[PDB]
Amino acid sequence: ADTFSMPKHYGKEIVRLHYIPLLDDRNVNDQGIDASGATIANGNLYGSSR
């Protein structure tokens, strides 16, 4: 790994964001519309089931 440096006037803690790509089981939401309307639970395309 490569070390990353922190600025001065920002406390003693750090934070970062992860974006969870679409076809993943962790992408849980309520924006799912089926192929004939009829809004459904899962907002992702068939999840990650293979």
Partner: protein, 50 residues
């Protein structure tokens, strides 16, 4: 008081002599000096992380 001043006036006679002597005086006035001060402390983490 008129009576007291009239009674204690420095009257003089014809003969003269040692009849009216006076004197003077002086007094002192004093001063002073004093010292004052105050301080404060802090740490480096407070300066760097605020």
């Amino acid at each position: 008081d008129v009576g007291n001043i009239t009674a204690k006036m420095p009257t003089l006679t014809e003969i003269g002599g040692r009849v009216n002597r006076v004197g003077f005086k002086r007094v002192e006035i004093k001063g002073k000096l004093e010292k004052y001060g105050f301080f404060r402390e802090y740490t480096q983490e407070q300066l760097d992380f605020d």
